Amino acid sequence: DFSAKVIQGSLDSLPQEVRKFVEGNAQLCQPEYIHICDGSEEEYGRLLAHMQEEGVIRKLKKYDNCWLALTDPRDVARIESKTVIITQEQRDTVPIPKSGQSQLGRWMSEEDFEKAFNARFPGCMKGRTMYVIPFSMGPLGSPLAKIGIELTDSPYVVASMRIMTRMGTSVLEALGDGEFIKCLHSVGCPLPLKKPLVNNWACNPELTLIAHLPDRREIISFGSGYGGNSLLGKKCFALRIASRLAKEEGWLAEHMLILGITNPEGKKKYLAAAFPSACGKTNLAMMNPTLPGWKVECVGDDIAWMKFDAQGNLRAINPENGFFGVAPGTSVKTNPNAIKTIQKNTIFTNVAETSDGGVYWEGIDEPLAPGVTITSWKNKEWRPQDEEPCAHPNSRFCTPASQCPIIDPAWESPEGVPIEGIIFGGRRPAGVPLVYEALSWQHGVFVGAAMRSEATAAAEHKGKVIMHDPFAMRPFFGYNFGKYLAHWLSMAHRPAAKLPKIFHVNWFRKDKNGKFLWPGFGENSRVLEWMFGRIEGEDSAKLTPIGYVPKEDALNLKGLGDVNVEELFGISKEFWEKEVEEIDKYLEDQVNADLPYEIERELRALKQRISQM
Ligand SMILES: Nc1nc2c(ncn2[C@@H]2O[C@H](COP(=O)(O)OP(=O)(O)O)[C@@H](O)[C@H]2O)c(=O)[nH]1
Ligand SMILES: O=C([O-])CC(=O)C(=O)O
Ligand SMILES: [Mn+2]
Ligand SMILES: [Mn+2]
Ligand SMILES: [Mn+2]
Ligand code: NA
């Protein structure tokens, strides 16, 4: 009985199964105190002020209620190699790769995990408060919403979860005696500290392990206080666990933005887009269109939960309550709506700070007044000419979604929004045209499966080498990728299903000396215009070996000067021969026995179309 240690709420007021979860882990982790979060403004402000007292965060004086955390440099992003899923059989979690090293997930046996667990969690919260975070993924009363309980010894986690999820007492009241996903987190630094504290950021890099136990409905994360590792509702729950549930239950959990777009004829359509981490999702989702009479509104920027309704419409909700966006590159010119969103009530991690108490990062495009100096993310003085960046490449803002000036009026509608198009894309410097359209659902699933993109700073992958990232979900598959492909393909045999048109984009094609062929950002509205017309049934497409592309003059290029058109839209036989062979060998190695017949067929079909050019 840990009742005596509860400093907010009551164990008696908790639902039966919630009490057992809290108490069992209190027995194991040995916290000094238990704080059951209520999600109130008062709780939030006081916790922020306490972190400020302890030197864990700094207040940003230029803004209304904004804060800055600077981490231990060993804890700065997701670590895919220390992120594991436990199942009875390895093949349920990843396909068995021919080469013996899977690039589609990482499995750990039940036995190996139990040993890892016992080596980490006993006593891990000694001298700390265990915070109990009741959270809902998805709008208030959405039939698509799922609730979790996260236990953590990090106030930083509590604060960020308030922004990124719906959290507090009303969630507990909604849960009742229902099921919840069990999320356990520790920074892994019990008191007294056995190792030095670096930058007042508690973490345990050597023992970092982010584990998922779908058959137990548990997420268990140790050693990292950073975003994707510690905010367990986001990647761990809403993608890894949820994708598996989605498979089981007939829906989809995807690494997708959702946006609403209205044309000059007063018609609105919703689109979803899957681009890899740090490949343009947030920027597209809250785009400021350059084309007159067009408007974009943001439903979500990162995760989509989608389910076909009784009428056959693919209805989507954003399960998150905030944006956890990449900071560097964000500017008034590139993402004006993000800049407006983050002006108040926002937590920044690993960005720079100006002497005026403002935020700073690479690509902010914000000349500072003479005399204003910069403190880098490492808490050292920094000059514009210096070798290293002022902000970490994976620095983040964590901001309430309700503050986006173009948040969609239906972004919290319980039934969700009807998706009419799904867009795939990544960073490809060569060979891949600005936009093309899949020939069929099956072709579209292949296009998703074949996605490749330059590495980014979102995880541990350095350099810019082109990596396979199918459906932008390589770090996030909750189960066997072959079975995931099967699941997607099965949607075509569901009665009444209105299958969205599928497109592939490339914002990132570079010419022969390394400059972008396409301006992008707000100009991407010209591509969305084309997609919108295609959904409407417009005669605006020409057939090519890779799919449909815009006809001559179909794309609105007015005001864009002499854009190098057939360099941007060029399709080389030699490039695509190479491409298809590479896709072939990848799928054979990585997916093997679990590759759906229909994907192999699309591969064969593409190879044949290419062979005839
Ligand atoms: N050149 C170019 N860069 C972009 C575009 N969209 C986003 N970016 C940059 O890519 C980085 C990550 O963008 P973001 O929208 O946050 O991607 P996300 O992590 O998938 O949400 C930022 O530095 C952006 O400025 C684009 O259309 N063109
Ligand atoms: O790690 C996170 O939570 C941020 C994110 O959305 C990504 O890196 O894809
Ligand atoms: Mn993401
Ligand atoms: Mn982003
Ligand atoms: Mn079929
Ligand atoms: Na710090």
Coordinates of N, CA and C and ligand atoms in Angstrom, one line a residue, residues 77-78 226-229 231 234-235 239 255 276-278 281 302-303 320 324-326 394 396 457-459 475-476, ligand 2:
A77 N 18.0 12.5 -29.6 CA 17.1 12.0 -30.6 C 16.6 10.6 -30.3
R78 N 15.8 10.0 -31.1 CA 15.4 8.6 -31.0 C 16.7 7.8 -31.3
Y226 N 14.3 12.1 -23.8 CA 14.1 12.8 -25.1 C 12.8 12.4 -25.8
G227 N 12.1 13.4 -26.4 CA 10.9 13.3 -27.2 C 10.4 11.9 -27.5
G228 N 10.8 11.4 -28.6 CA 10.3 10.1 -29.1 C 10.5 8.9 -28.2
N229 N 11.5 9.0 -27.3 CA 11.9 7.9 -26.4 C 11.0 8.0 -25.1
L231 N 8.1 10.5 -24.5 CA 6.7 10.9 -24.7 C 6.0 9.7 -25.3
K234 N 3.2 9.2 -28.3 CA 3.5 9.6 -29.7 C 4.0 8.4 -30.6
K235 N 5.2 8.1 -30.6 CA 5.7 7.1 -31.5 C 5.4 5.7 -30.9
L239 N 2.0 5.0 -33.0 CA 2.5 4.2 -34.2 C 2.8 2.7 -33.9
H255 N 2.3 7.3 -40.1 CA 3.1 8.5 -39.9 C 2.7 9.5 -40.9
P276 N 9.1 10.8 -44.5 CA 9.9 10.4 -43.4 C 10.1 11.5 -42.4
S277 N 10.6 11.2 -41.2 CA 10.9 12.1 -40.2 C 11.8 13.2 -40.8
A278 N 11.5 14.5 -40.5 CA 12.2 15.7 -41.0 C 12.3 15.7 -42.5
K281 N 6.7 17.2 -43.5 CA 5.3 17.0 -43.1 C 4.7 18.3 -42.4
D302 N 1.8 14.9 -38.0 CA 2.7 13.8 -37.7 C 2.1 12.4 -37.7
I303 N 0.9 12.2 -37.1 CA 0.3 10.9 -37.0 C -1.1 10.9 -37.4
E320 N -2.8 13.3 -31.8 CA -2.0 14.2 -30.9 C -2.8 15.5 -30.6
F324 N 5.2 18.6 -32.2 CA 6.6 18.3 -31.7 C 7.5 18.5 -33.0
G325 N 7.6 19.7 -33.4 CA 8.2 20.0 -34.7 C 9.7 20.3 -34.7
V326 N 10.4 19.9 -35.7 CA 11.8 20.2 -35.9 C 11.9 21.7 -36.0
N394 N 18.4 18.3 -34.4 CA 17.1 17.7 -34.0 C 16.4 18.4 -32.9
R396 N 13.8 20.9 -31.0 CA 12.4 20.8 -31.2 C 11.6 22.0 -30.6
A457 N 18.3 13.9 -39.2 CA 18.8 14.0 -37.8 C 17.8 13.5 -36.8
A458 N 16.6 13.0 -37.2 CA 15.5 12.6 -36.3 C 15.9 11.4 -35.4
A459 N 16.8 10.6 -35.9 CA 17.3 9.4 -35.2 C 18.9 9.4 -35.3
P475 N 11.1 3.2 -38.9 CA 11.4 3.2 -37.5 C 10.2 2.8 -36.6
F476 N 9.0 2.6 -37.2 CA 7.8 2.6 -36.5 C 6.8 1.4 -36.7
Ligands
LIG2 O1 11.0 11.7 -32.0 C1 9.9 12.3 -32.1 O2 8.9 12.2 -31.2 C2 9.7 13.4 -33.2 C3 9.1 12.9 -34.4 O3 7.8 13.1 -34.8 C4 10.0 12.1 -35.4 O4 11.3 12.1 -35.1 O5 9.5 11.4 -36.4

